[PDB]
């Protein structure tokens, strides 16, 4: 169970909230895979290449964290890594019942596959990607909400 | 972080939902402490001594699980165990925002103390101790909702 | 299924919201049983006998409606009436997830027993017995919130 | 009231959850109309023709259930059938207040028109069309979630 | 603080609910600016020109209310008016946590900028723009839900 | 409307969240009445006299703020002050729908009486008196959650 975890996400963009979750989850698992979704259904603000580079840059200081691009079925991705744990983040604005529904769907597709929920720190408890995209989209200062080493990337495009 | 986890609760009484959380959370920590709080102010149906003895019997098969009854603040109890991770369960009828608040209250009181959330099995996602207490008080069949090694007792007193 | 419906409740006291549900649900079943639960553990403001007598008077105009007071599990009461359908009301302040849970708890206890939900009228969508008890305890005007054929009583004791 | 009910939906696709609701509702009403919406505002995964054929196939075993295509105002559709009852389904992931708002909107447009809520069985309480579309879209196995007689249709396109 | 308030919105279209909020808020502030957003992200049913004319017509009877078109960052707009108060409306169907998140985001961008929540009247508590657009889109009667002096405009296009 | 505001509460005890609401709401009204309700039926931890004396000391710096203890219906108390605006606070764990209901209940009882909602500061958005009472009862450090001018007292009795 504790050998490997997968943290799936659009990471559009990576926020301080996401970094808290990568931090706490990487401490518990011998290896954390951060799986960067295509999300085409959602038309993301940042391209996969941008979103992979932001999260790879934001996570250089974690040695057991690997970033992969992924466009498939999470249940299948976990099986190919022999992964028994999906990492998810919970925040004030979470659709909690939707999160539970997703945990039971993923476990129906892969009977080994459990879901574990982490919280960001209190200062980040009201951060959501959607806020950050709104503040970016409206040419506001998002620099307090995202790791400083990726702000140069987001602020542009 | 992986050395010790604390699963705190009133456990009035321990249900099958609680057992799924102990099962799953115990696989992630070298040692799991099940911490049964007096919870005087609540007016628990079962004495603190009955509740400890019920969970003690229901967990006897889990070799790295230890049960303790405590009178104080949970945040101080974790500091005494050098415990950095609280374990909580998430269910359909959880008060999700109150769990978040209690997570941050526990952090503000012990700055090393994160909260992590597991889910019970889908069959048990609809169990609450509060349902279980109604059925017990109206002298109904709760056999299907609690571990059988305790039902000798709740069914009686 | 259409032979008999049971509308269970504490009815402490019966409100205009409850009357809309009895009105609408009684049109769908050949016979509707209004089942007033003791609900000891709750600490109802009105005695079980006062609550039965209030709903009895408030429903006397509905010819296929019958009121009964019961001490036991609702699921067993429905089995005694060969009743397959529980009637419940949905309001703005309903605990929607708890209603769902209680529906499935009632099913797990009596495998023939579905729960169906009606709505009160829009004017009454904002009434709860809990509001009504606050107004009564602070000796205020609840006349607008309950059927007048009971207000002789609640207003007094 | 009990003569006819209408069960409106996109049915994109029909799930085991929808079949539970058609089952329980068809038992209460002398006739159930299943009204298959265009939903163009939502760009449905399956075409009206597919969605009409799936639900007509999934409901052959109910003799008092008719399927019609419909692109209009539910309030007007109910009036043309002299229908006094809209059937809706409630699940763990429901927007409960939105469901109430829709019941009062439909009753404002047609003062005869009441809304009644059914639950699916517990095994189906976490099924939603949106889950099923996600699992389909991601080339996952949705066969446990939809009636077997329509899986051949969905799995393709 | 009490000198000026800003009431931002898409107003797609202006509802009786919005007029209640403009009414109560204009009584508290020496001046209310109603800021009509582009909302392009949302593809609004009515054009900015329509939405500015509806709200300017619906508010002629309030002498301290000004309507402006606005496409920017609310935090910056408030600073240019030296405004310390964002007016927002709360209804049964509100995403309450999202409203709180937006209040803290706007205050992070402008440390002077507080958010104040008004309620519409009870008769309007279930009105939402989204309902009104649905009833319009479905060629239903929305005349009970929007000020009569703007119905001629909406009903057309 | 701007002449007088009433901020009603149990204030058991007054917290830093409450102080932010008094601070912000007092800037908007010529005079703010902090109305401490007996709330017998609740079983407040602090006597009505202790609660008045705590808020009295915590507000002594606010020159237009006056504290009063009352036994009756709030709606009648506002009528006695010729008060048209109730002030309430909104927090992460607020029961948002119950606040709305109580707003409309207060209106139906006093037809001139609107309710307005403020937010505390982000640091205090996660405080509830209920958290504070748990910490006090388990004899823990609540110093960080209440105004220090009261902590002489709560910490003791
Ligand atoms: C008992 C519990 C873990 C909650 O458990 P429950 O939800 O099973 O009742 C919580 O109330 C607790 O920690 N109680 C011990 C005393 C304490 O620390 N209270 C302050 C909480 S911030
Ligand atoms: C009284 C009620 C119908 C709920 O009614 P209420 O919401 O009006 O209090 C429910 O508590 C009930 O069924 N009580 C009787 C005993 C019972 O069956 N309890 C177990 C519920 S699964
Ligand atoms: C005390 C309160 C303001 C709510 O405050 P709280 O949420 O801090 O307990 C409310 O219960 C109240 O107004 N109580 C006084 C009596 C009353 O008017 N009750 C009827 C409410 S419609």
PDB file of N, CA and C and ligand atoms in Angstrom, chain B residues 8-11 37 39 42 70 72-75 88 98 102 105-106 109, chain F residues 134-135 138, ligand 1:
ATOM      1  N   UNK B   8      -8.849   9.071  16.054  1.00  0.00           N
ATOM      2  CA  UNK B   8      -9.639   9.486  17.222  1.00  0.00           C
ATOM      3  C   UNK B   8     -11.143   9.326  16.970  1.00  0.00           C
ATOM      4  N   UNK B   9     -11.939   9.138  18.020  1.00  0.00           N
ATOM      5  CA  UNK B   9     -13.396   9.045  17.856  1.00  0.00           C
ATOM      6  C   UNK B   9     -14.096   8.897  19.174  1.00  0.00           C
ATOM      7  N   UNK B  10     -15.407   9.079  19.153  1.00  0.00           N
ATOM      8  CA  UNK B  10     -16.302   8.729  20.283  1.00  0.00           C
ATOM      9  C   UNK B  10     -16.616   7.228  20.212  1.00  0.00           C
ATOM     10  N   UNK B  11     -16.748   6.629  19.025  1.00  0.00           N
ATOM     11  CA  UNK B  11     -16.995   5.180  18.762  1.00  0.00           C
ATOM     12  C   UNK B  11     -18.124   4.633  19.653  1.00  0.00           C
ATOM     13  N   UNK B  37     -12.235   8.948  22.840  1.00  0.00           N
ATOM     14  CA  UNK B  37     -12.381  10.155  23.689  1.00  0.00           C
ATOM     15  C   UNK B  37     -13.554   9.965  24.643  1.00  0.00           C
ATOM     16  N   UNK B  39     -15.692  12.155  25.686  1.00  0.00           N
ATOM     17  CA  UNK B  39     -16.790  12.902  25.038  1.00  0.00           C
ATOM     18  C   UNK B  39     -17.969  12.981  26.015  1.00  0.00           C
ATOM     19  N   UNK B  42     -21.053  15.560  24.622  1.00  0.00           N
ATOM     20  CA  UNK B  42     -21.891  14.535  23.963  1.00  0.00           C
ATOM     21  C   UNK B  42     -22.434  13.753  25.147  1.00  0.00           C
ATOM     22  N   UNK B  70      -8.937   8.373  26.391  1.00  0.00           N
ATOM     23  CA  UNK B  70      -8.293   9.633  26.810  1.00  0.00           C
ATOM     24  C   UNK B  70      -9.367  10.666  27.171  1.00  0.00           C
ATOM     25  N   UNK B  72      -8.443  14.171  27.542  1.00  0.00           N
ATOM     26  CA  UNK B  72      -7.903  15.512  27.276  1.00  0.00           C
ATOM     27  C   UNK B  72      -8.154  15.953  25.859  1.00  0.00           C
ATOM     28  N   UNK B  73      -7.382  16.942  25.436  1.00  0.00           N
ATOM     29  CA  UNK B  73      -7.323  17.429  24.037  1.00  0.00           C
ATOM     30  C   UNK B  73      -6.559  16.413  23.183  1.00  0.00           C
ATOM     31  N   UNK B  74      -7.127  16.068  22.041  1.00  0.00           N
ATOM     32  CA  UNK B  74      -6.493  15.146  21.079  1.00  0.00           C
ATOM     33  C   UNK B  74      -5.115  15.658  20.652  1.00  0.00           C
ATOM     34  N   UNK B  75      -4.980  16.962  20.385  1.00  0.00           N
ATOM     35  CA  UNK B  75      -3.744  17.607  19.881  1.00  0.00           C
ATOM     36  C   UNK B  75      -2.597  17.369  20.857  1.00  0.00           C
ATOM     37  N   UNK B  88      -9.015  10.207   9.886  1.00  0.00           N
ATOM     38  CA  UNK B  88     -10.485  10.362  10.019  1.00  0.00           C
ATOM     39  C   UNK B  88     -11.137   9.685   8.837  1.00  0.00           C
ATOM     40  N   UNK B  98     -17.091  20.908   8.823  1.00  0.00           N
ATOM     41  CA  UNK B  98     -16.707  20.728  10.250  1.00  0.00           C
ATOM     42  C   UNK B  98     -15.453  19.851  10.357  1.00  0.00           C
ATOM     43  N   UNK B 102     -12.084  21.160  12.055  1.00  0.00           N
ATOM     44  CA  UNK B 102     -11.487  20.400  13.185  1.00  0.00           C
ATOM     45  C   UNK B 102     -10.027  20.051  12.835  1.00  0.00           C
ATOM     46  N   UNK B 105      -8.275  23.384  13.418  1.00  0.00           N
ATOM     47  CA  UNK B 105      -8.238  23.588  14.882  1.00  0.00           C
ATOM     48  C   UNK B 105      -7.128  22.730  15.506  1.00  0.00           C
ATOM     49  N   UNK B 106      -7.002  21.461  15.091  1.00  0.00           N
ATOM     50  CA  UNK B 106      -6.014  20.484  15.636  1.00  0.00           C
ATOM     51  C   UNK B 106      -4.605  20.937  15.269  1.00  0.00           C
ATOM     52  N   UNK B 109      -3.478  24.032  17.306  1.00  0.00           N
ATOM     53  CA  UNK B 109      -3.150  23.576  18.697  1.00  0.00           C
ATOM     54  C   UNK B 109      -1.850  22.753  18.742  1.00  0.00           C
TER      55      UNK B 109
ATOM     56  N   UNK F 134     -15.398  23.309  22.991  1.00  0.00           N
ATOM     57  CA  UNK F 134     -14.720  21.990  23.142  1.00  0.00           C
ATOM     58  C   UNK F 134     -13.360  22.226  23.807  1.00  0.00           C
ATOM     59  N   UNK F 135     -12.593  23.186  23.291  1.00  0.00           N
ATOM     60  CA  UNK F 135     -11.211  23.467  23.763  1.00  0.00           C
ATOM     61  C   UNK F 135     -11.288  23.880  25.231  1.00  0.00           C
ATOM     62  N   UNK F 138     -12.198  20.844  27.562  1.00  0.00           N
ATOM     63  CA  UNK F 138     -11.022  19.944  27.687  1.00  0.00           C
ATOM     64  C   UNK F 138      -9.810  20.765  28.123  1.00  0.00           C
TER      65      UNK F 138
HETATM   66  C1  LIG G   1     -13.862  12.889  19.433  1.00  0.00           C
HETATM   67  C2  LIG G   1     -13.363  13.721  18.241  1.00  0.00           C
HETATM   68  C3  LIG G   1     -12.096  13.069  17.680  1.00  0.00           C
HETATM   69  C4  LIG G   1     -14.443  13.651  17.156  1.00  0.00           C
HETATM   70  O1  LIG G   1     -14.880  12.273  17.108  1.00  0.00           O
HETATM   71  P1  LIG G   1     -16.387  11.857  16.637  1.00  0.00           P
HETATM   72  O2  LIG G   1     -16.611  12.680  15.381  1.00  0.00           O
HETATM   73  O3  LIG G   1     -16.320  10.340  16.423  1.00  0.00           O
HETATM   74  O4  LIG G   1     -17.272  12.213  17.822  1.00  0.00           O
HETATM   75  C5  LIG G   1     -13.024  15.143  18.734  1.00  0.00           C
HETATM   76  O5  LIG G   1     -14.147  15.694  19.404  1.00  0.00           O
HETATM   77  C6  LIG G   1     -11.857  15.220  19.705  1.00  0.00           C
HETATM   78  O6  LIG G   1     -10.698  15.308  19.300  1.00  0.00           O
HETATM   79  N1  LIG G   1     -12.165  15.208  20.999  1.00  0.00           N
HETATM   80  C7  LIG G   1     -11.156  15.225  22.051  1.00  0.00           C
HETATM   81  C8  LIG G   1     -10.970  16.591  22.633  1.00  0.00           C
HETATM   82  C9  LIG G   1     -10.483  17.618  21.643  1.00  0.00           C
HETATM   83  O7  LIG G   1      -9.323  17.614  21.241  1.00  0.00           O
HETATM   84  N2  LIG G   1     -11.345  18.586  21.298  1.00  0.00           N
HETATM   85  C10 LIG G   1     -10.963  19.767  20.540  1.00  0.00           C
HETATM   86  C11 LIG G   1     -11.113  19.533  19.059  1.00  0.00           C
HETATM   87  S1  LIG G   1     -10.266  20.789  18.067  1.00  0.00           S
END
